[PDB]
Amino acid sequence: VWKDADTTLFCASDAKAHETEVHNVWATHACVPTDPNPQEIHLENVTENFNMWKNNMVEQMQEDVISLWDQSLQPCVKLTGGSVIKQACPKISFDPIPIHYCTPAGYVILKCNDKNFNGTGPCKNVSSVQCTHGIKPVVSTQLLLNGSLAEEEIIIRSENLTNNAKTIIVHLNKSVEINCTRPSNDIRKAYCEINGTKWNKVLKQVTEKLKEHFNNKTIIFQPPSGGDLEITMHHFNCRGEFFYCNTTQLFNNTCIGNMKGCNGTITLPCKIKQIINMWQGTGQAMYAPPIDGKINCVSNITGILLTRDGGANNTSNETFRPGGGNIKDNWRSELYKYKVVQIE
Amino acid sequence: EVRLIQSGAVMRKPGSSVKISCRASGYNFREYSIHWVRLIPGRGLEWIGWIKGMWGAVSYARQLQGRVSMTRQLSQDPDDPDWGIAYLEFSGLTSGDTAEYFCVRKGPSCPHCGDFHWQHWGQGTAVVVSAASTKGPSVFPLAPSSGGTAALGCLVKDYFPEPVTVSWNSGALTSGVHTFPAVLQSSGLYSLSSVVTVPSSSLGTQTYICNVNHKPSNTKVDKKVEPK
Amino acid sequence: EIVLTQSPGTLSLSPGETAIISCRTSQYGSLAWYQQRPGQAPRLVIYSGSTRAAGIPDRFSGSRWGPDYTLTISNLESGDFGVYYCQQYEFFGQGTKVQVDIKRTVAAPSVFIFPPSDEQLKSGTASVVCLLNNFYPREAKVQWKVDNALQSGNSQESVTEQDSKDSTYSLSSTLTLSKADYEKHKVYACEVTHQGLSSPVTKSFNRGE
Numbered sequence: 179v180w181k182d183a184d185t186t187l188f189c190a191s192d193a194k195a196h197e198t199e200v201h202n203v204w205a206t207h208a209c210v211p212t213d214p215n216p217q218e219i220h221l222e223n224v225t226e227n228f229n230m231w232k233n234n235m236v237e238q239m240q241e242d243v244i245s246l247w248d249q250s251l252q253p254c255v256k257l258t259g260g261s262v263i264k265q266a267c268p269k270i271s272f273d274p275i276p277i278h279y280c281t282p283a284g285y286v287i288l289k290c291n292d293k294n295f296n297g298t299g300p301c302k303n304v305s306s307v308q309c310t311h312g313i314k315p316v317v318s319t320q321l322l323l324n325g326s327l328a329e330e331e332i333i334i335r336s337e338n339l340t341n342n343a344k345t346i347i348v349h350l351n352k353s354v355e356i357n358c359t360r361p362s363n364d365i366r367k368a369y370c371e372i373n374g375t376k377w378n379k380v381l382k383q384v385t386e387k388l389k390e391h392f393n394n395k396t397i398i399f400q401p402p403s404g405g406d407l408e409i410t411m412h413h414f415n416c417r418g419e420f421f422y423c424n425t426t427q428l429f430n431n432t433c434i435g436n437m438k439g440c441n442g443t444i445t446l447p448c449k450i451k452q453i454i455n456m457w458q459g460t461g462q463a464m465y466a467p468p469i470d471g472k473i474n475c476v477s478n479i480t481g482i483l484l485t486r487d488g489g490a491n492n493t494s495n496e497t498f499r500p501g502g503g504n505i506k507d508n509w510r511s512e513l514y515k516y517k518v519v520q521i522e
Numbered sequence: 523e524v525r526l527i528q529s530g531a532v533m534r535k536p537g538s539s540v541k542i543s544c545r546a547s548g549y550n551f552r553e554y555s556i557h558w559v560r561l562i563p564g565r566g567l568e569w570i571g572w573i574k575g576m577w578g579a580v581s582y583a584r585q586l587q588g589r590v591s592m593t594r595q596l597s598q599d600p601d602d603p604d605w606g607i608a609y610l611e612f613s614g615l616t617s618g619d620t621a622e623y624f625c626v627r628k629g630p631s632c633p634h635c636g637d638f639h640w641q642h643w644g645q646g647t648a649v650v651v652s653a654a655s656t657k658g659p660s661v662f663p664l665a666p667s668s669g670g671t672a673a674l675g676c677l678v679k680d681y682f683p684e685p686v687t688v689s690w691n692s693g694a695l696t697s698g699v700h701t702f703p704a705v706l707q708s709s710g711l712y713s714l715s716s717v718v719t720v721p722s723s724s725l726g727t728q729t730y731i732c733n734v735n736h737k738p739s740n741t742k743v744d745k746k747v748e749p750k
Numbered sequence: 751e752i753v754l755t756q757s758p759g760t761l762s763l764s765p766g767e768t769a770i771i772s773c774r775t776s777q778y779g780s781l782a783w784y785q786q787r788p789g790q791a792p793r794l795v796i797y798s799g800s801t802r803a804a805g806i807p808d809r810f811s812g813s814r815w816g817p818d819y820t821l822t823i824s825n826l827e828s829g830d831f832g833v834y835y836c837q838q839y840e841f842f843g844q845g846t847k848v849q850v851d852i853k854r855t856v857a858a859p860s861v862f863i864f865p866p867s868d869e870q871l872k873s874g875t876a877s878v879v880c881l882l883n884n885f886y887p888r889e890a891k892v893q894w895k896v897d898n899a900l901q902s903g904n905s906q907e908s909v910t911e912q913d914s915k916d917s918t919y920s921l922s923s924t925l926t927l928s929k930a931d932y933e934k935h936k937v938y939a940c941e942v943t944h945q946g947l948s949s950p951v952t953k954s955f956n957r958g959e
């Protein structure tokens with residue numbers, strides 16, 4: 179039959195060789211052309227155990243994205259080897275594209291199709307594919323952007339919910355647009371627009387789903403307790419600029435109870451920063467000031483990273499705060515239904 | 523090898539704050555987390571929270587929220603990753619916060635080893651929270667009275683902080699001495715007793731002085747013990 | 751959440767003997783055991799049920815038996831004594847105290863009671879002391895009665911280490927209260943229970959000697 183195995187995967191995309199956009203350039207050299215007619219083979223009477231938290235495919239992606247940024251987003255200033263390095267840091271073109279990950283000869287990818295698979299455990303509806311779906315390498319904190327939605331129910335993912343040290347990944351089944359803008363005309367001031375009605379209805383569903391897992395305890399949200407700005411804020415890269423958006427308004431409990439007074443647009447304060455703690459864990463990097471003109475990008479909130487407060491407590495409520503952990507968890511959120519096996 | 527070195531002990535008044543450090547080394551500080559835990563006299567161990575090296579993300583124990591904060595410090599040079607400093611700040615202190623605070627880290631990664639299995643510990647930081655001021659002891663005589671051996675001793679009450687030493691007859695009388703461990707009264711001041719069993723035939727003969735010493739307050743006091 | 755019922759609260763043994771500590775859990779996660787010696791940092795003894803941490807000798811062992819996790823320490827050495835805690839996530843057991851005891855013949859405690867001195871009575875306070883001297887085993891109970899009435903909350907006990915030469919224990923009990931209260935009553939007594947006593951011994955006094 180086969181056994182679970184680790185190997186080097188190769189990538190595939192629809193990258194455009196003529197584009198100057200950084201992801202396209204990288205994909206052009208690193209990836210092969212995508213297959214128009216992929217052959218997906220479903221396997222009858224097969225049970226396979228998956229574990230999204232122990233999946234080396236995630237490690238591969240992490241290295242590809244690290245390699246990507248290393249080639250095209252070198253900073254103006256950084257610390258390395260007891261010296262400060264000064265580099266030419268021109269403005270780039272930045273827009274992530276979908277990357278497929280594919281198995282070499284002798285291997286194949288098994289794909290869980292259970293519409294409510296939570297990431298770990300047995301899968302019945304298993305199919306065999308040579309490549310994953312198109313995955314965008316969107317690096318972000320707190321909110322997961324431009325990802326895939328859950329087919330049916332909202333899915334709570336966690337290696338172990340009782341362990342407060344383990345990140346909780348909420349997989350949404352309906353997207354919520356986030357509309358972030360640096361208005362053309364403080365050049366670092368920006369803002370993100372969100373539909374309060376859309377968001378508060380979604381957030382309500384999340385709590386009810388969390389009640390199912392925490393025995394109908396009062397579900398409360400709160401802003402991050404502390405840490406670097408990259409986490410206490412919604413941190414993401416848009417058109418080559420690093421944004422930091424306050425999400426204090428996105429987790430207002432008053433608006434998801436059982437009255438209103440908050441049904442309109444939510445405008446999050448944002449700031450484009452030049453000095454940043456790199457997500458690769460390489461240290462502080464310094465970038466040049468933002469391009470002129472109107473910087474804008476409309477993204478889909480497809481998931482939420484949460485950490486639950488711990489400590490001895492039997493107050494009715496359980497508290498959750500935005501912020502997840504590794505950027506690796508962003509890759510986990512998409513690769514959760516895949517695993518590599520070697521043929522016998 | 524992993525090493526965790528904390529800052530020194532400290533005394534504190536109620537309502538004040540305390541900041542504790544924990545110097546880590548021997549491993550990539552960004553790839554791990556530091557948990558804080560306290561050992562409370564008579565109440566056992568209590569988890570306080572953790573902080574992650576990568577971004578300094580934190581999770582505080584619910585019952586301590588609003589009084590604790592954790593930050594960390596590390597190198598921005600990726601060629602010097604194997605050190606860091608975790609900080610724990612505790613505010614709105616009370617006498618109930620008197621405890622030994624420790625910084626810990628998980629053991630080597632394994633399928634079994636969770637994040638709460640702590641192989642490594644700092645040596646601990648003793649924090650004492652007290653309203654009481656430095657105070658010398660009042661000494662009273664536990665008079666002897668009516669194989670006949672009589673018992674006498676000295677009652678040392680209401681002093682702060684520890685310790686007090688008790689010798690008998692300038693330390694010449696040691697046979698039969700029992701100086702009990704001090705006890706903390708509800709008042710917040712310490713108290714102990716020192717007793718000695720002696721020949722009942724010697725009460726009309728020998729002299730029995732108890733010498734009480736208390737460094738913190740520069741007090742020495744000799745006290746005679748007799749019956750009636 | 752997780753509750754951790756640890757027992758027994760105290761355990762008195764001698765070198766070469768074996769200690770058996772248990773921990774009942776409401777959940778079934780990874781349980782670990784820690785040892786904390788006085789003035790020393792706690793140390794991981796066992797984790798994930800039965801696996802020994804680094805350095806720990808093979809005489810330490812844990813069993814996965816039921817919702818009840820147990821720690822066994824056979825052929826006790828002097829370094830094995832201290833306070834042991836079970837742990838599950840951020841939750842800890844109440845702690846079991848494993849202290850040394852040297853086996854010797856039983857000895858009844860000589861009991862003395864000390865009235866308050868006059869010097870103290872002029873401070874609006876009166877302390878009454880009840881000494882239990884040179885007895886074995888260490889387990890003993892002191893109970894204060896004032897005019898045939900049992901007391902609670904107003905007494906503090908203190909015990910010495912086991913003596914090096916004669917292998918005995920001494921114990922003090924201090925009944926504290928205000929002068930005003932002290933003067934209102936007449937008879938004061940402490941009752942002592944001990945394995946070396948066939949019946950509970952009593953020592954008492956009034957104000958007339």
Ligand SMILES: *[C@@H]1O[C@H](CO)[C@@H](O)[C@H](O)[C@H]1NC(C)=O
Nearest residue numbers: 179221222223224225226302
């Ligand atoms: C798989 O399914 C077929 C048809 O239902 C069954 O006959 C076969 O025994 C199954 N395999 C195993 C291992 O039971």
Ligand SMILES: *[C@@H]1O[C@H](CO)[C@@H](O)[C@H](O)[C@H]1NC(C)=O
Nearest residue numbers: 296298299300334335336339
């Ligand atoms: C996922 O489902 C498995 C059973 O297949 C269960 O053991 C596990 O607890 C579930 N995870 C979550 C986060 O509910």
Ligand SMILES: *[C@@H]1O[C@H](CO)[C@@H](O)[C@H](O)[C@H]1NC(C)=O
Nearest residue numbers: 220291292293301302303304
């Ligand atoms: C498993 O997949 C089949 C085929 O797509 C689908 O009809 C079925 O709904 C799934 N399983 C369950 C229990 O619904």
Ligand SMILES: *[C@@H]1O[C@H](CO)[C@@H](O)[C@H](O)[C@H]1NC(C)=O
Nearest residue numbers: 324325352353354355477478
């Ligand atoms: C954003 O979400 C909408 C549904 O709300 C979807 O149709 C669209 O394809 C998404 N666009 C992305 C992920 O770029």
Ligand SMILES: *[C@@H]1O[C@H](CO)[C@@H](O)[C@H](O)[C@H]1NC(C)=O
Nearest residue numbers: 330331332333351352383387
């Ligand atoms: C998303 O899933 C929830 C169940 O968690 C379901 O009630 C809801 O209908 C789904 N989506 C929408 C748009 O309603």
Ligand SMILES: *[C@@H]1O[C@H](CO)[C@@H](O)[C@H](O)[C@H]1NC(C)=O
Nearest residue numbers: 355357358359361371474476
């Ligand atoms: C996003 O917000 C900006 C605000 O300046 C607005 O001009 C733009 O039309 C919005 N786009 C969408 C798709 O909502």
Ligand SMILES: *[C@@H]1O[C@H](CO)[C@@H](O)[C@H](O)[C@H]1NC(C)=O
Nearest residue numbers: 372373374375376441442443
């Ligand atoms: C939010 O969504 C609702 C649909 O439920 C829509 O009517 C409303 O116009 C949206 N908000 C804005 C500002 O357009």
Ligand SMILES: *[C@@H]1O[C@H](CO)[C@@H](O)[C@H](O)[C@H]1NC(C)=O
Nearest residue numbers: 407410411424425426427447
């Ligand atoms: C976000 O905004 C709130 C005000 O609504 C402010 O109190 C908070 O400090 C802000 N967050 C950060 C990380 O600055």
Ligand SMILES: *[C@@H]1O[C@H](CO)[C@@H](O)[C@H](O)[C@H]1NC(C)=O
Nearest residue numbers: 425426427428430431432433
């Ligand atoms: C939450 O709602 C309150 C009204 O109860 C409002 O004053 C506050 O601004 C809201 N918080 C955020 C972060 O939007």
Ligand SMILES: *[C@@H]1O[C@H](CO)[C@@H](O)[C@H](O)[C@H]1NC(C)=O
Nearest residue numbers: 274323324414415475476477
């Ligand atoms: C998400 O996708 C949209 C459309 O593909 C794009 O405009 C936007 O910049 C993307 N978001 C991020 C954070 O890259």
Ligand SMILES: *[C@@H]1O[C@H](CO)[C@@H](O)[C@H](O)[C@H]1NC(C)=O
Nearest residue numbers: 338341634636778779780781
């Ligand atoms: C679930 O969590 C507990 C405690 O964190 C741990 O003992 C157990 O190993 C975890 N489950 C798995 C499959 O690792």
